[PDB]
């Protein structure tokens, strides 16, 4: 009943010196930590998160077309069937295109409309590519400030090589959200670790399960007729608990970085208005086992 709601591994850094440390690396890459939330790091490093505000993205690339997902707004622990009588696994999104500027108008308007003193659909801008140094140099330069183990460029500190860009397409991704925006359940591609920073002002609610349980999750997807690997799905928490699977549940506030270990099954819902930025940091999970 309480081994199933485990505490989420969490670090608060009072000093930047502790970010540039193999001790922090080892804490994060410990495979017993499906994720780790690092607080105070954006602050300590004085990262200009304003460079990732929607206003800034519109100024730089408002005319660019991006993918948008349309979803029924539901509480994070719910996913109803057509008849509104039962919970289900499949997580339906329609996929469409709009411009960054158009998404930004919707994001800002919906926020403005929420300010009154105390079904529905929402739209989520996904897979916004910030990889091109020709368009996004200031943003990428800010990301170069992170410790080498969390850095997009690893131990490198350059964005060009002999006059050519070096990052491939879709290396750095941004997600523009409103409350209800869901990232359905998945493991990170290629068994790489990744990092995710919330720009705010709103929060993201996260759910995670240790890799060890992935096959049981896949079996649930099978029973509900959705592909584990390629399909869109949202776990029914009661099913997980009834199978004795611990679920990590936490909130990622503005400035918090989430380290995601390889194989961790996770899913996320915005509870506020926010953007998130994310990139992979290579196959670092359990690397310390090399030293033993
Ligand atoms: O929506 C997000 O912030 C998000 C969080 C964590 C992830 O692993 C993602 N993967 C792909 C697309 C989005 C996300
Ligand atoms: Na309005
Ligand atoms: Ni794309
Ligand atoms: Ni992901």
Q: Which residues pair with 269 in a beta bridge?
A: 182, 205
Q: Which residues pair with 194 in a beta bridge?
A: 260, 280
* List of residues 6+ apart from 242 with CB closer than 8 A: none
Residue 241 CA, distance from chain mean position: 23
Sign of dihedral through CA atoms 23, 26, 28, 34?
negative
In sequence order, what DSSP letters do the residues of 206-259 get, joined into one string?
Answer: EEEE-GGGHHHHHHHHHHTT--TTTS-B---HHHHHHTT---EEEEE-TT-EEE
CB 45 within 8 A of CB 150: no
Q: Beginning with the edge strand found earlier in the chain, give each strand of the sheet holding 204-209 in spatial order.
A: 182-186, 265-270, 204-209, 248-252
> How far, in Å, CA of 249 to CA of 206, rounded?
6
Q: What is the DSSP letter of 167?
A: P
Give the distance (Å) from ligand 2 centre to CA of residue 99: 20
Q: Which residues pair with 186 in a beta bridge?
A: 266
> How far, in Å, CA of 108 to CA of 185, rounded?
27
User: What six digits make up the tokens of 27?
Assistant: 């804490």
Q: Which residues are annotated as a binding site for Fe cation?
A: 186, 188, 266
User: What is the atom index within ligand 1 of the atom nearest the CA of 204?
Assistant: 3
DSSP tally for the chain: helices H, then strands E: 7, 15
- As for how many domains the chain has, the answer is 1
Residue nearest to atom 12 of ligand 1 (CA): 183
CATH number, domain at 10?
2.60.120.650
How were these coordinates obtained? X-ray
CB 175 within 8 A of CB 128: yes
In sequence order, what DSSP letters do the residues of 85-113 get, joined into one string?
Answer: SSB-SB---EEEEEEHHHHHHHHHHHHHT
Q: Which residues line ligand 1 (CB under 6 A)?
A: 175, 183, 188, 194, 196, 260, 268, 276, 278
- Ligand of minimum distance to the alpha carbon of 116: 2
Alpha helices by DSSP H, 20-163? 22-29, 41-45, 54-61, 100-112, 133-143
User: What six digits make up the tokens of 124?
Assistant: 């989520």
Q: Which residues are annotated as a binding site?
A: 186, 188, 266
Out of 268, 270, 273, 281, give the residue to mutate to test ligand 1, the one with the largest number of ligand atoms within 8 Å of its CB.
Answer: 268
Residue nearest to atom 13 of ligand 1 (CA): 183
Query: By C-alpha distance, which of 101, 142, 106 is closest to 279?
Result: 142
User: What is the atom index within ligand 1 of the atom nearest the CA of 127?
Assistant: 12
Domain that holds residue 173: 1-292
> How far, in Å, CA of 28 to CA of 35, rounded?
7
């Amino acid at each position: 009943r309480e081994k199933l709601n485990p505490p989420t591994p969490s670090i608060y850094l009072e000093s930047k010196r502790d970010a540039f440390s193999p001790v922090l690396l080892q804490f994060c890459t410990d495979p017993r930590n499906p994720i780790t939330v690092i607080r105070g790091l954006a602050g300590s490093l004085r990262l200009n998160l304003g460079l990732f505000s929607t206003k800034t993205l519109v100024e730089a690339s408002g005319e660019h077309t991006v993918e948008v997902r349309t979803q029924v707004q539901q509480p994070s622990d719910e996913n109803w069937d057509l008849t509104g009588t039962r919970q289900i696994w499949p997580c339906e999104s329609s996929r469409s295109h709009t411009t960054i500027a158009k998404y930004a108008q919707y994001q800002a308007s919906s926020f403005q409309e929420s300010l009154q003193e105390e079904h529905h659909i929402i739209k989520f801008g996904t897979n916004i590519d910030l990889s091109d140094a020709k368009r996004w140099k200031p943003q990428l330069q800010e990301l170069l400030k992170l410790p080498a183990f969390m850095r997009v460029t690893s131990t490198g500190n350059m964005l060009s090589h002999v006059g050519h860009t070096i990052l491939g397409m879709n290396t750095v991704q941004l997600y523009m959200k409103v409350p209800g925006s869901r990232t359905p359940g998945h493991q990170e591609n290629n068994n790489f670790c990744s990092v995710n920073i919330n720009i705010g002002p709103g929060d993201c609610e996260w759910f995670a399960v240790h890799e060890h349980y992935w096959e049981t999750i896949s079996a649930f997807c099978d029973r509900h007729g959705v592909d584990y690997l390629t399909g869109s799905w949202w776990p029914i928490l009661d099913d997980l608990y009834a199978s004795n699977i611990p679920v990590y549940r936490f909130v990622q506030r503005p400035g918090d970085l989430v380290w995601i270990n390889a194989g961790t099954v996770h899913w996320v819902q915005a509870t506020g208005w926010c953007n998130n930025i994310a990139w992979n940091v290579g196959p670092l999970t359990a690397y310390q086992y090399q030293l033993a």
